[PDB]
Amino acid sequence: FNILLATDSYKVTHYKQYPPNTSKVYSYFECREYEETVFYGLQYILNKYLKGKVVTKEKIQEAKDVYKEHFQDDVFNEKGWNYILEKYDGHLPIEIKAVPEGFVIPRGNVLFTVENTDPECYWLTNWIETILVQSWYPITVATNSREQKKILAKYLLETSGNLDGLEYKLHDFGYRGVSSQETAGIGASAHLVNFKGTDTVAGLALIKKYYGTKDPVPGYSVPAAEHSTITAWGKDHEKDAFEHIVTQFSSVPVSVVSDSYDIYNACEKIWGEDLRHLIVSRSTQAPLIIRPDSGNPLDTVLKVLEILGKKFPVTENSKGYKLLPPYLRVIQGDGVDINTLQEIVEGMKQKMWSIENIAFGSGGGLLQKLTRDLLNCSFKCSYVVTNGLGINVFKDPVADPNKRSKKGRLSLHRTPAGNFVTLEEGKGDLEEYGQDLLHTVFKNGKVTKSYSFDEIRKNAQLNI
Amino acid sequence: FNILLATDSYKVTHYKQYPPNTSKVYSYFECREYEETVFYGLQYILNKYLKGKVVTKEKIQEAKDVYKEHFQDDVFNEKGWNYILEKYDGHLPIEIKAVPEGFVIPRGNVLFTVENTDPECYWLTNWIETILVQSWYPITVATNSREQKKILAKYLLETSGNLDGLEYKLHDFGYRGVSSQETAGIGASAHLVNFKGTDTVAGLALIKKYYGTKDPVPGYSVPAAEHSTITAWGKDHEKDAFEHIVTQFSSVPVSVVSDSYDIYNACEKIWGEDLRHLIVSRSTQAPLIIRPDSGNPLDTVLKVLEILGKKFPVTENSKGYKLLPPYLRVIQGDGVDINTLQEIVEGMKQKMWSIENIAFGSGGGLLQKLTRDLLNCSFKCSYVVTNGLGINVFKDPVADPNKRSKKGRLSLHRTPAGNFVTLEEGKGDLEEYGQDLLHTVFKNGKVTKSYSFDEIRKNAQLNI
Ligand SMILES: CC(C)(O)C(=O)N1CCC(c2ccc(NC(=O)n3cc4ccc(F)cc4c3)cc2)CC1
Ligand SMILES: CC(C)(O)C(=O)N1CCC(c2ccc(NC(=O)n3cc4ccc(F)cc4c3)cc2)CC1
């Protein structure tokens, strides 16, 4: 990795664009005014990309050669990068202050600030905008996952009277559906801030290396079938595939995809009749989890439950909701996003089915179908010092008041009613509010404050 | 990187689910049912993740320890992975056949096939599905970028009579807007299959390392301002910022964001009057490129062009379209996706503005706002050998005929009219459609066939 090659091209040319005699460039990140966001992921970026000796003679030469060809001009700040190498042994003279990871903050608040600690590196602040703005992705996955947990918690509490097993109700199926191996790890780790069920193995090693848990692992899974393990038996031997699979995993929960040919037939005739004796004998700790994987997600879930309800002993829980026997559950793992998740749990409640009956698997909806636009994650310069005088800077486009940025030195505070407020123009310097909630997390090439994944999960807890 | 930890969790348990005495598992990839797709990105995955010694005793032990905790049980195939290490020195006994990279193929055709070369490794074929299915991402970026080039080519031809500078008309602004550094490189490289303009520097090194070009670089950029380089001068010194920037880059094209406070005022009064003398003196090789960055993308482009048309000398080209002087252009770099790109060029044509006047910058729309669902990229088992007998395997869900998969051994052929056809059930073995278009690209840990980035670009060319 070469940080000199880890920026938008045009940032290579910005050192010649700032006002002459500029000694400080101070910038901030916010999720411009999903009412609240989970701050997560910056510690990964600080450690993997920004800390320690990030500048070498070889990296400067490599960047110089690439940019000469890329621009067809010599515009690269070789002097500026050589200065950091000589004066700081390649360590970045930047100070980053951030809200603690896992913190749940309303939209339009300062989440982190960045500034150069040496007047000579005024240009460095926004050089690293590209890399830091990528924190939008773990913030957005964590936020969107937590919003799904709110929906699940609400319906599980209403239909059962408690939240038991809530952290296993939304499983990450997104490994194949993301854009890269790196994204897989980051995205899966952000989902694990709220849940404990994952198939995206990449997430485990990222948490282990960059965050850490008291438990050996932050996420868990169970044995499960795929179409290849069912269909490999041949179209006429679907029952043989099912029988073999539930017998191989007779003492642990087992998920079995049942829609290869006819989901409704598999539920009613194969599970419901032919193999019913292998299901009703299963432990409460080892249910069969039937998995539909096609059709309208709500219509399929309801029809599967109505079929199962007629083949298996259903009880009525203390809330008046229908409950399958404990050796039998359903996981809907196709077409799940925050919208369909809501439609399904509402549909189940209307048909008097407890949410204890179901779990959800989500791939693209959980880890890929997200953009920087969802939370309006934005990094902007708010303060500069030029000729020894600090000036409060901002943008305010005539056609879009929503794109107006904050002015001056910023600080995040608790209000008297316990809410949040971002103080602009250095007004945090007046001791009118409590202590600033932003802490120095990075300074002059060193990570100065870190959080465990356990601390992050506690911070991200729901009120319920 | 550890390939034993680079799969969906449930795939760890599949070796115990296939029929006993299974010696071959053969699977394929297609973009089920954007009528044609650019095949790109597999060579990156083959080299970075699949080739050479990918299994070590340490990797087996690391996977065993992780899975024991992740499943709360011993389900990991230690014996199977140790076999590959001992017999093949950790080289994968897999054979992958693929259509050449850059090839433009209609939907619903076999793009690549995977199968084990050792009967003992029947479980390996689908172990690597997760890693290979991630090729959906470079395929989708390349396809979506090429569809935008079709729109640009059509309107540029119609309004100017030629395609000059077409490959610089859609610039990649997506570095900050993607989910990771790895995704940035992959996505930027896929855009460069069709265009030559990029700010996502990560793309350059990926192409250099995995594909290669005759030219020193596959992509190019020009100096450009950002809001921080304008706003740092203070709200009352926007003219001073603009003057400094165009003077610093007086001999190369320069892009200048002009919407910090009032885009229309900046065009009419600042560029159009106060600084007009610094613009009209510019070389044809060094235009000022005015950049709006907010408001309705079409309304803003049209209004900016009407303002500029009244302040600067406009000509009528040979097609009857309005053309700004050669030292002045516009780039729309906000809210650009395939839909808005179409709306803008159509809007310009209706108001008699040549597409030579404009270029587009696209970030999230080009590299992030995409999913595996857009082209229905899918990997499925189509053929297995059990007890020495080959059987044609497929799925066919009752509620979704679109999810029906292909049967048996597959082959890709040219039809008599020069179109494409995927032959199923080993029917390619009959010499009726001639030679199979898929080539062995990977075999037993080695890449057996590769393409340069130059070969890929030629293959991906538009007919026009
Ligand atoms: C249902 C209840 C009571 O909430 C519960 O007991 N649990 C515990 C068991 C839990 C679980 C965990 C993993 C799986 N996995 C699968 O179905 N697969 C993994 C996949 C990965 C990728 C993919 F494309 C498809 C997949 C199918 C099922 C269920 C749900 C909650
Ligand atoms: C206009 C015409 C004739 O098609 C032409 O001459 N060319 C040549 C010059 C070309 C070009 C190349 C790069 C840039 N860059 C920028 O504006 N920035 C790069 C950014 C990256 C990220 C971001 F958030 C904002 C950005 C602003 C402008 C223009 C357009 C086609």
UniProtKB/Swiss-Prot annotation, chains A, B:
Its main location: nucleus. The modification Phosphoserine is found at residue 452. Diphosphate binds at residues 176, 227, 291. Inhibited by FK866. FK866 competes for the same binding site as nicotinamide, but due to its very low dissociation rate, it is essentially an irreversible inhibitor. The modification Phosphotyrosine is found at residue 168. Beta-nicotinamide D-ribonucleotide binds at residues 199, 291-293, 333-334, 364, 372. It catalyses: beta-nicotinamide D-ribonucleotide + diphosphate = 5-phospho-alpha-D-ribose 1-diphosphate + nicotinamide + H(+). Pathway: Cofactor biosynthesis; NAD(+) biosynthesis; nicotinamide D-ribonucleotide from 5-phospho-alpha-D-ribose 1-diphosphate and nicotinamide: step 1/1. SUPFAM superfamilies: Nicotinate/Quinolinate PRTase C-terminal domain-like. It comes from the Eukaryota. It is found in: Nucleus; Cytoplasm; Secreted. It is an enzyme of class 2 (transferase). Keywords: Acetylation, Biological rhythms, Cytokine, Cytoplasm, Glycosyltransferase, Nucleus, Phosphoprotein, Pyridine nucleotide biosynthesis, Secreted, Transferase. Belongs to the NAPRTase family. Catalyzes the condensation of nicotinamide with 5-phosphoribosyl-1-pyrophosphate to yield nicotinamide mononucleotide, an intermediate in the biosynthesis of NAD. It is the rate limiting component in the mammalian NAD biosynthesis pathway. The secreted form behaves both as a cytokine with immunomodulating properties and an adipokine with anti-diabetic properties, it has no enzymatic activity, partly because of lack of activation by ATP, which has a low level in extracellular space and plasma. Plays a role in the modulation of circadian clock function. This is Nicotinamide phosphoribosyltransferase. It comes from Homo sapiens (Human).
